[PDB]
Design a protein around this ligand. Sequence first.
Ligand SMILES: Cc1cc2nc3c(=O)[nH]c(=O)nc-3n(C[C@H](O)[C@H](O)[C@H](O)COP(=O)(O)OP(=O)(O)OC[C@H]3O[C@@H](n4cnc5c(N)ncnc54)[C@H](O)[C@@H]3O)c2cc1C
Length: 251
Amino acid sequence: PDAQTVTSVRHWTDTLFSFRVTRPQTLRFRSGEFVMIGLLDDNGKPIMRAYSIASPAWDEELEFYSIKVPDGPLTSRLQHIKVGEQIILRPKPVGTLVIDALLPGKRLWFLATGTGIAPFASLMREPEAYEKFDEVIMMHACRTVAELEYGRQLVEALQEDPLIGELVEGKLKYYPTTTREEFHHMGRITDNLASGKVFEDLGIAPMNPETDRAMVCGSLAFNVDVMKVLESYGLREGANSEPREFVVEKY
Ligand SMILES: Cc1cc2nc3c(=O)[nH]c(=O)nc-3n(C[C@H](O)[C@H](O)[C@H](O)COP(=O)(O)OP(=O)(O)OC[C@H]3O[C@@H](n4cnc5c(N)ncnc54)[C@H](O)[C@@H]3O)c2cc1C
């Protein structure tokens, strides 16, 4: 049943975990895309859900970053997955969070809350991002410090990696914030873009449609709020068939 085997699991909190799985031979994707994964219910019927692939396209192993919803049909079960066990993975990638769906530009922004960092876990490790852009800005906002941990460790490890670390050097700017716990930088993405705080903090020019391209991943509310701010700076939604300055993915 499109089965793949789990090779690693890390629990970040009781409501957040990541895992790696073997890669289907026929899967060809672009960093930022998503696929469907799942498990069988009591009656043998698949419980299938859209998931961003959190590993870059070049990686022979796949990574996922998952919520656990206590009464959620999939994740109430998926949270208990172990190394050596199998998941269903349909190798049909889709999604608009891909570099091909943006006009060429100079700065690339990843704007994520919660598990929305997942496609950017992929793209931050994608050579094409650093080939096609001079700066890559990762804004990740969560309520609590523990919710940032998967991403903070990902960025530490990629910065230390002799291959990826070299590609991202002087290009990747990582801007994690919390909104409900004290942390070195705080505040919503919407608010820190609108006030210009992120520009002040990183010491970079304000957002403009000539140079900036952006990708958004998170809840419906998050996307709605962030889109309004992007539009306030003159950036337009495109995806493809007609690429423009930003793309969004809402769940
Ligand atoms: C394009 C796309 C990409 C996705 N990528 C991811 C991903 O990388 N990681 C991930 O954990 N989920 C992701 N999701 C959500 C995922 O498809 C499922 O909803 C999730 O696995 C929960 O499944 P469930 O059956 O346990 O609960 P569901 O019945 O699917 O959802 C129950 C409730 O929990 C909320 N909820 C579900 N998922 C999340 C979440 N991730 N964060 C906050 N609230 C949530 C829902 O809004 C809903 O109210 C993605 C969804 C879309 C459409």
